[PDB]
Design a protein around this ligand. Sequence first.
Ligand code: NI
Length: 341
Amino acid sequence: TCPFYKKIPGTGFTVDAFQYGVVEGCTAYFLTHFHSDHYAGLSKHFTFPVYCSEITGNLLKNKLHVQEQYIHPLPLDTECIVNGVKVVLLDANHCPGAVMILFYLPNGTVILHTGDFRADPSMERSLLADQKVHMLYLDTTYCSPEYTFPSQQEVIRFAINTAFEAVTLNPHALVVCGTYSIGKEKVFLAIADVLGSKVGMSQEKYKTLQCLNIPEINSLITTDMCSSLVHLLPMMQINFKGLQSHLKKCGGKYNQILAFRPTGWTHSNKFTRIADVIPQTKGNISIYGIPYSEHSSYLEMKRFVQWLKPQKIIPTVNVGTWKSRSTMEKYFREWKLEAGY
Ligand code: NI
């Protein structure tokens, strides 16, 4: 059944709850972002109102084929009324079109649901500064102090410098970037930009990117692989066999591959700096795992919550085991005692 952490009390609303059939009592289904665990269950046969950002609405229409009449896009940073309840959508700093949702309940309670987010100090000057939030439905993906990672800026700097040096030493080296969802487009765009190339990709991935309202996108991507020296591939193909394979396909236009795998966290975060990363190498193929995260570090999350001072926290991630639940509740109490709310 639909878990309690997907239901908004005192409304008929649910968040990211599309794979339970009809939820008894649900009058409006909100969708925070277009990632498959969140949208799972949506299709052309859905006949209930879906509320989401413009970008998530373009993807529901074009990639899932949900019918236009059931898609209700809302602008960001704007007080809107949905079935008689005031709501605001805020940028989540996750993937394109990802939002947080503020619900103002008729009883006076204010609820923030973060969806998936990477907390940032800039959020402390959004419409959240304006009033008190009583309950927080929190993205707890990396709620443990071992999870450190560098800034997005630091990681992109590294990738840019690595690629530019490699291709300048060898003009017949190909750059390959893995992907399996929207998100992390800065990685392959920033590399393409320093190399004076457009990024080349499959027809399905191009279609996906043309939904995202990226400015000048037509100048930055292409379906013609041959003209491009930054290729996107399915993340599954980012390994030596898949890359050798792909290398044959280019018809001797390249003799070397430099590949990036943008991971979340991986245990080498606990021992190694971004300046000191090294790749896995087999012949003329090298693979860098780079820790580009679109989720809050432990410290970023802690700062956000200690700023917001919620009365109650409901985790939405890692909720499946008693041990995870208990560990999370311990950190929340530490935070509250240190900060005095
Ligand atoms: Ni996500």
